[PDB]
């Protein structure tokens, strides 16, 4: 019996997620973030984009 899962990553809105517990957002600091699997580091802030 064969099942082939097909998906794409870090390009569009995501509904299937891994079993990672979220965390309260921390802004204005050199933090390592993980938004829907997109890791990295930097400084978060708010803005207005359509």
């Amino acid at each position: 019996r064969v099942v082939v899962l097909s998906f794409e990553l870090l390009h569009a809105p995501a509904t299937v997620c891994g079993p990672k517990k979220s965390t309260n957002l921390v802004k204005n600091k050199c933090v390592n973030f993980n938004f829907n699997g997109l890791t990295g580091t930097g400084v978060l802030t708010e803005s207005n984009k359509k």
């Binding site: 050199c30 990295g40 580091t41 930097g42």
Partner: protein, 50 residues
């Protein structure tokens, strides 16, 4: 043919003397803010010292 008068001509010529001084940071250009990449960049440090 001998001149019998004259004109006092003022000519403008422009010469570039300098250009914008610039500096480059290897670490934050190549390996933006990730430590994993910057560790790999140590072995190429000599190149940046150039």
């Amino acid at each position: 043919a001998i001149p019998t008068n004259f004109t006092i001509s003022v000519t403008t010529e422009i010469l570039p003397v300098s250009m914008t001084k610039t500096s480059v940071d290897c670490t934050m250009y190549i390996c933006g803010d990730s430590t994993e990449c910057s560790n790999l960049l140590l072995q190429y440090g000599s190149f940046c010292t150039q």
